[model samples]
Structures are given as structure tokens and as C-alpha cells.
Target: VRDFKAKVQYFRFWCQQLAMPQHIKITVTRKTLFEDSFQQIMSFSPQDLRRRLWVIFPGEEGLDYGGVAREWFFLLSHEVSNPMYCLFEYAYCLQINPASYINPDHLKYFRFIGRFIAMALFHGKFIDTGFSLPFYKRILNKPVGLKDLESIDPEFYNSLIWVKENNYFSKEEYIRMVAEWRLSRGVEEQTQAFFEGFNEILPQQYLQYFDAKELEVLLCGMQEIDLNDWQRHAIYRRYARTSKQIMWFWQFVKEIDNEKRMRLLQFVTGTCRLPVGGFADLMGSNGPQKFCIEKVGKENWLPRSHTCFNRLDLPPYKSYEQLKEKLLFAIEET
Candidate 1:
């Protein structure tokens, strides 16, 4: 433990030496050091160490040190309120369009690091309010005094304080908040329908992003929704850009009048197709065109390998009694 604290102090020194526009190479040695140290830190879970630490990889042009840290943080033995930490930390990412391809996992951990930095340095206290943005706002706006800030070394705390100050959302977040506020009365029907349909499918945290008005605005031109200036651009390049777009498409499709949704599904599946210009052109950019093609080729409506039910030979028995009868018949036949 003594050596660990000493090593952390040295690590803090190493971070202080780097300039803002520096290029950091996260070589194997540093990665191993960071991981091992995190392992030790996590083992003492639910026990505050009364020590503060800083780990920064700013202006690291190419290396994803932030990504490395987030993954390690998620792997820690932390409480479930972890999602709230992500909300406060990566609210910028959350404020963007739902189809923006941000890793839900990465967002959670991105803020996890921020919370750790705050608790370690400022003794920042946060409660998990379980998907309540109102609760989050109350905590973020709460103030800290000089005496509370004086507990940590000036060199280290000053270096780390930016994470707390800049921890909240960007302009995009404010825009979203205003948009939701303005559209509240206008999109009531669509909003209620959407909430009723997706209330169970989407996580509580996810539902916070699109208060009715935001959802109504987002659902416009679902097939041709614009992706320009979408924040979290790095994630789009990392994952499939088309896959993300399709996710947005489904979010819209789920909320509309059920009969209209069914008609569009049938049209997309067979009787006709999205015409050559709008939906077709948008899909040309990597939408689920391949999924349509795959559906055309498959004679049976079997589940894909990745779907919840992947076995092709299983009987489509809806009831447990029917499944038991099928099992007995199969045994007798064998």
C-alpha cells in the first residue's frame, strides 16, 4: 500500500510534465502499470482510501487512453449506480442523436472515471437517483468550498479539477434541453405512444435523452434523418456507420401508428420498396439493405445466429404444454 501510493504520486508527476498538445504513446509497459494499479484500487472496493490520484491523457491525438481508462473503470468492483456516473460524465454523448453510435458501455465508464476523480480529490458526493435527470442536475449544481478543495495537494488537485468543472454537457446538451422544453405541448400524442411502446424495451437511462419533444423532432424524416454534425463522430468510425443509422430508423418506426408501421414493414419486406430517391438513397449509405437481401434469400423465417432464439430446428410452440408434447413425441420417435 505504501509503494502503491508512492507510485501514484510518481504517476501524478508524470502527467503534470506533459504539455497540452502532446502525443502520448500508451506502450505495453504503461498499459500494464495502469491496469495492475487499477486492479489493486478496485480490490479495496467500498473502502475509501483517503487518497487522491490523477491520470490524464489529454490532447493525445491518436491514442485512446480515455478508452483504456474507461474499460478498466467498468471492470472495477463499483456500485450499480454506475449508470448515473455515466450520465453526469458523458451527458455530451447522450445529448446527441440516438443513432450516433456511442457505445452505451463506453459512455457509462467515461463518467465513471470523472466520478472517481471527484470523490478522490474533492470528496464529491453523488447519489444514484436511478435515471432521474432532475436528481442529477441538483447534484451537479451543488457547490464546493476552498477548505474542501484544500485537502489535496495543489499541484495534483489543480491538474485534476478540470475533470470536475468540465464534467457536464456541452452546447448540444443545452440545445436538446430547450428543444424538449419547446416541443412538449405539440408532440403529446406521438410522445405518449412512443413512451407506451418503448417503455419496456429501452433502458431507464436511455429514455432520459428523448423527452417527448426531442423524440418528435428526431422522428421527422426517419428514413432520411441527417447525420451531419453529429457529436461522437469517433464512435461512428469505430463501429458500423450504417448499423447506427438503422438503429435510429427502428426507434422512429416503433413509435408511429401501429397500422402504419405494419404497412411500411410489409412494403419494405415485399409488396414494394422505398422509392429510388429518399429512403433508397439514404439506405445506399449502408442502411439495413443487406438485411433485406438476406431476408429475401432465406426460405424460412429463422432467427439469425446473434438473435435471442438461434436454433433453427426448435418447434415454434408458444406454450410450455405444447413444447412438452413436442419433446415427448421427439423422444418416442428417437
Candidate 2:
């Protein structure tokens, strides 16, 4: 299945409405092959995995009973990271095995059950497929009854990667251009077009929600960083100091509304607190600024040692095993 052609064939079978299972076994490639394969291997080409996967799990419709097929679906969903992971997971669970499943019509709902659980577990973390805004327009044309994630995860609403080659220029470019332009948009027509066309795909609703709770987010972040000093003022200053860096950190949050701008500020400040050394190494004198947290309700306020950005980097999920269990419970409770 890891073979490129096998992967394509797997997709062709399902895409063509073929009932036969794909027989290829995907090659295990890369370190942590089982886990990161979705991103490292199948991320760009899910059809390969899908074709091979469908054979083992079978069907995209609702199901009645669960068994080996269901387990495989769970494993795939739990392991892989991709745009259609949830849908595929659901397809594997909901659909019945046409031939052997006794309660084939049983609304297996495995995908929904697993996905909702996964969603809650990684409540704040999900893949940003980077699908273009036009991609969403296409989904809009699909049958109304069909469930589409692009609806839940919108593009042009989240963030973007500012690669230099793509005409994003360098971090300093924006600051230099800021004086000439409105700072939000671009200056000249050419510059405007370059920026206007660049952005990443993320759910608008989620980004909006983050906007509303900017302060709350910062407060939560400070609690994690300055375990000793949990004052709101200290956290607020930290965000204020890096406001520019926050924008420069990623194309996603730059030029966002005051509300979203602040929350994203908290996200990067707390999450990617790269130290001065690394920051200096990368941005030279423009490296990260110094941040200090003052002790609250105490006699002597002490500032914590400055930390590097790598130390604070937050992964999409901190602990997967713990998260998965928590996700399972969240879905059940909800």
C-alpha cells in the first residue's frame, strides 16, 4: 500500500464505486512510521492510504456492529494526521460491510463517535489543511445532505505561512512597508496583491472565538509560564512587548482584528517562547525581546529567567495517549 501506484489504485476503486477491497499492504516508511505517516507519507496523497484502507474497513455509510474492520478504522484515525482523517474515520465506522456484517444497517456511526471524541480531546488543536478559499466554494456545490469538514474548517479564515520566496519578503519588509501603507493591507498594488493572495486555511469560527477571549487566553498562558507570578498585569505586558513579533510570527494572525490579534498574541507568546540566543541567532538583533513576570501579592517581585523559544513550543497535542482517553470521555459526557 505504501507503493505510490497501490495508493492510487486504492482511491480509484472507491472513487469508481467498486465494492472489492484493495489488497495492497502499505509499506511502513519513516521514523514513527505508524504515527506520523499520515503527515510524513500519506498527507499529500491520502487516496493511496484510503484505497488500501477501505478494503480492510469497508463502506462509507452507517453501520450496525463493530469488529476487526472497526478496529482498523479506529487505528487509522487515531494514528494518521490529514485533512480527511475525520471523514475517513467516520466512513469506516458508519458504513456497514455489505457482505458479512449481520446488522449491516445498524448505523455503526463509528466515525462520528470516534471523530467527535477526537475533536473534544484535541479541542483546540486540529490540522489546518491549507485548502484554498476556492476549495470551499467547490464543497458548497456538493449535495446538501453530504457532511463536509471544510465547513467546520474554513480557509482564508485562519493563518498563512510567510515564505520569502512566495514574495512575503522578510520580517523587516513588513515593518518597512508599514509606514508607506495602512499596515493592515499593502502599500502599492503589486505589494497588495502579493499579500492578499497569501493566507492559510483555518476555521473562521474557532479563530473568531479566540478573538473574543484574548485576555483570558493570555492569563491562562501566564499561569503556565510564570508558575510563581500569576498576575494579569505581568502577562498583559508580555503580550504588549511582543505585539509586533506576534504578527511577524505567522501570516495567520498578522493584521487580524484587535480581538483575534490579541489571542493569537497569547498563543505565540506562550507557545513559541524562543529564547534570546536562538532568537538572536535567527533574527540577529531583531531576535525575541526580553519578557519578565513579576511575583504577585508578595514582598519582593522576582523576574523569572528568560527562556528560549524552543522551550515553550507547543505541539498540536502535548500527550496523545492522555489526550485520546480524555477525548473518549468528553464525547461520552457530551
Candidate 3:
């Protein structure tokens, strides 16, 4: 048998194919993303959820070969994680709102939120935002000690850390109290319900080997796009590394800042972030697909991607200037 690292890698690969059997669909309007998603997902069982999702955009298109689902997951995740939603607080980073229990049916919403996140995690999708340290700790059933508090609430930690758990008068009590209140408090009930919904997809026992930090990487992948890694792992067709167009392509990647670079990656790969282990682990509908720069058409086709395959169908261009101009416009405006 292999070690936990091997187990985790296998788990990550398996999650990418969670939706392999059949497809469940989500149709929503931009203005009513969360409201619509709540209704649709609530009606379905966990079994229904485990399949691929076909996001149907009414009055536009219903293309769901991975990109559509990626768009839906990105948008809906942002909606729920938005500060407007009482379930989460987003001052520094995402954490459970201390007073969120006041909302009607808050536990129900939290349960739904847990399943929602599970869907994305299983399908290898990304969330628009991140969670605080303690939030990740709770997911992996790790202790949130005093050291983990400052990142989330420095004021709370300053007083506690200054005291330094003197070990004189129930110091352990203070640590527990702080961790309890900061991580759970009034929302403890909701968190449990959240845990329940998450368990329906993958039991906690399966995740025992992963640490909290790796859990974050599991859910929200690395945003840093190593440009060299991009070229190194990239596969090409109808083009060579020394080809002028290929040179222009690499040149254009460096021309833009990280923002445009991110968008370009998103344009091709659906998720802007790299999966764990970087570009070589880039996933597709079938399995691992490296980033591809394949030539097509006679300079008229603006670049397009099959996110299912991590590919960009680039049109042959007359010049580096044209390649840059067309690519910039395509990724931004397309």
C-alpha cells in the first residue's frame, strides 16, 4: 500500500471524475444566482448532485462541456460568500458570521452551503474567495489553537497572546473559549449541519489524512501561474516550440500582468488557479490534459478553448503584433 500522500493524490484525481456517470443541470439568471441555485439544488438528492452538472443559461446557451459548470460554480460560490449573505463574514477573509444564526433557517442555509462547496470540491472547481485559517482547520477536524487566531482576529489574539496562557488560572479554559467563540459560537449548530451535508458526498473518515492547509489547496487551488511551467507542460499540435507563432504566444503571456494572465488561464482552463502539483496536473473531462496551444483556421478565428481538454485553438496570425492584438482582444472581449 502507498502512503497518505499517494492516497491524497488518488483522491484528487478521483474527485475530478465525480460527475462521470450522468448530468444534473442548473439553470439560473445572473441577478438571482443564489436564489435560483438554492431551489434547484435543494430538490436534488446527494446522488443527483454527485453527477456532472450541465449549467443551462436561458436565452443564451446551454454549453456544459465543463466550462459552463465552471462559470456557474464560480458565480454561485461568489454569491453565497458575498458579505450580503448573513451565513459568512468577509472582512479580511471568509469566516462564519458569529451572529448568523439570527437569520431565518440559517442552519438550513449552512447545510446547503456545505453541500454546495462539496460539489465544487468533488468536481475540481474553484471558489471566488478564500476562507480564514480556522475555517480550514474545522473542515479537517483540526484544533484551532491560540496561534491560529491572530490571522482571523488580531485584537482577540493580542490580549490572549499577551497573557501567553500563563497556566495559572484555567488558561486552557480561555483557549477553548476563544477557539469556540471564534470558530463556532452561535453558529456551532449550523456548522454541524454543514458537516452533515458535506459528509453525504465524502465522509470525514476519507479526509483524515489531509491537513487543513492541504484542504485549502484541495478546494481553492493555487492562483500563482508559473509561466515557465506553463510552457514546459504545454502540448502543441500544428505548431513547434521554435515556430514564430509559438514564440509570439509565449511573449504575449509575459506581456500581460498577472490579472490578464489569470484571465487567459481561466479562458482556457475554466479555473484560473493551478491544481496541486502545478500545470502537469491540469485536468480535463477524461483525465490529465496539459495546456495546449493548437493551430487552427486562417488567421480569422479568434482564439477559443475547450476547457474539457485544457486547449486553446489559436488561429495562425501574420505577425507577432497581430497575434498579440488578437489574443489580447480575444481573452478580454470574447
Candidate 4:
């Protein structure tokens, strides 16, 4: 324990005192409380520690560090959420957009989203009543809704997938597809008869985006009927941009604030602030106190804010395993 604390102190010194872009590497020989050390400092869960800690590439441009850190932080917070909701939404994202990391099949990714959801649920339950759900239900095994439109219109479901994949359609094509499905299913009324009156307000131009299949599912499942035509298009566009735009907004603002809060939380144990630039000074000098030491010939090696550490000579990293290799290198004592 003594050695561990000393080492932690040393690591802290390197981070705080070293100039910008300084890399302090730490290597673990076996399973250790290193994860615990992370929790002790930030209260981030085990899953979060593993998943969110994306290492910078050996030669990653220094300017991109802040952006990368933000991405990792958002992902870490998402992991801390409830496992049930996290897993279900992850599956949904995968089904809809497999390219996103949230849909990754790896357990590490699951843990990451788990941690994020946990924090989200925690805050929602106590701090924000609006986000908390009264019923304790897990939707992983359940359908989106019991007796959804698909249950009533199986033909609509069967035809829509193909129509949607093929692209936009004329009203005649859409009506014919629905008409065929209804006829086969033994229906007398129009399949879109439910939306006939509402179509007056819906723009005909906007209908081009949905193929027959999408229209069948979309019109049937839409939660909001009161939305104006323009508002509906705006919402659809926003949904499309969510994957990338959300991360960008969350990175610099939310994560930077989170890191700042974690720093101040050190006071919970009544630990005093380490002092502005004092952390770097302590590492460069011998012993804890500056005056007590006699040596005057020295320079500080502490990492400064906005500093850049470029490892141009290091080999390229093809995977996170490779990146973690570089991180392990950075966490070492200089």
C-alpha cells in the first residue's frame, strides 16, 4: 500500500508538473488495484475505466487530443447507465446503424454503455424527476410495443422493407403496394385510409424520402400526429445527424466540465488543493518541500495545460490494443 501510494503520487506529479504533451507510462505486471486506483480518484466504474480510456495514437496530432478526450468521456458516461436500457438501445443502434461504436458487439463496449446508463439513471432518479420512469421494467426481451402496427398489417410489413430499400416512390406506386397488401390480407378499406385526412397537411415533396415500406411503418408508428409538416422534417433531419453531432456537442462542453468537477471532488476527503503549478514543482525538486532542499540547479518537467507530446518515432497503432500499448508507455515515470 505504501509503495502504491508513493507510485500514485509520482504519477500525479508527472501529470501535473510535466510540460504539455508529456507522456507518463505505467506497466502492470498482473491484476492489480490499478482499476481501484481509478475508481478512488474519479469513482468511474470498472467497465468505464476499460472502455472509455481510449489512448492517443503514437503520432496523433496534439490539437486533436481535446476532441478525442471528449469522445471517450461521453462513451464512458453512457456505459455507466442501466444495463437493461443500455443493452436494448445498443441493440437498436446496431440494427439501425452498425457503424456506430455504441452498437459494437464487444463486452467492453457493453460495459462502457452500462457505466454511462448507470450514471444517467442515478441522476435521473434523484436529481431530475422528469427522466425517471416509475415502473421498473426491462425492455430487452419485449417488443417496442405490444400489438404494434405490424401485428395488424403483416402485409404492410412484408412489402415495406423492399419498398424502402429501393428508394422514393410515386403516390401510385405507394398506393398500389398498400392496395396489394390489403387485398391479399382480405381488406376492403384503403390501407392508408387512417391517414387520409391528415395527408392534407403533409407535404407531397417530403413523401419522396420514404419508400413504400418506410411510409407504411413510419405513418403507422409515428408517436406525434400534432407535428407540423416542417417540424416533422426538422425532427427527421435531427435524428439523422444525431450520431455525429451529438458527440461533437458533448465532447468539449460536457466532458470538460465533468473533468473539472472530478478535480474539485478531491475536497470531499478535505484534501487541500495541490496548489497552482505546485504539483509540477514538487516533482522537479527533491523531497516534498522546496525550501528544505538545498539543490538549486534543476528544471521542472511537469506537464502543463495544452502541452503536446508527439511520439513520431513510435510505430503506428492499428487497434486499441496497440494504442493502449502506447498509453502504457506514456503512464511510465520519466
Top-TM-score candidate index: 3
Model 2 scores a C-alpha lDDT of 0.27
lDDT-wise, the better of 1 and 3 is 3
TM per prediction: 0.18, 0.21, 0.61, 0.19
Cα error, candidate 1, residue 140 (Å) = 2.6
lDDT of 3 at 269: 66
Please give the lDDT score at residue 122 for candidate 1. Answer: 26
How far residue 155's Cα lies from its native spot in candidate 4, in Å, is 11
What C-alpha lDDT do the candidate models reach, one value each?
0.29, 0.27, 0.74, 0.27
Give lDDT tens digits, candidate 4, residues 122-199.
111111111100001111111122112232344565566555557554444564555444322421221122122112
Winner on TM-score (1 vs 2): 2
User: Which residues of candidate 4, in runs, are more than 4 Å off?
Assistant: 1-55, 72-109, 116-334
For candidate 3, write residues 1-334 as lDDT tens digits.
2133475677776565444587887777788888888888888888888887788778866544588788888788777766566888764146677677677788877888888877777777877666754777787787777766655566887788767646343466676677567756566787898898887776565566665555655566546678998888999999999999999999998887665677688568655556658888887757878999899998877887776688899889999999988877776641
RMSD vs true structure, all candidates: 25.4, 20.5, 15.4, 28.4
Q: List clashing residue pairs in candidate 3.
A: 19-52
Number of the top-ranking candidate, with lDDT as the measure: 3
Q: 3-105 in candidate 1: lDDT tens per residue?
A: 2234334434443322133232222223344344434433432223223222343343435555544433333323322343222212201121222124444
Tell how far residue 289 is off in model 2, in angstroms.
4.6
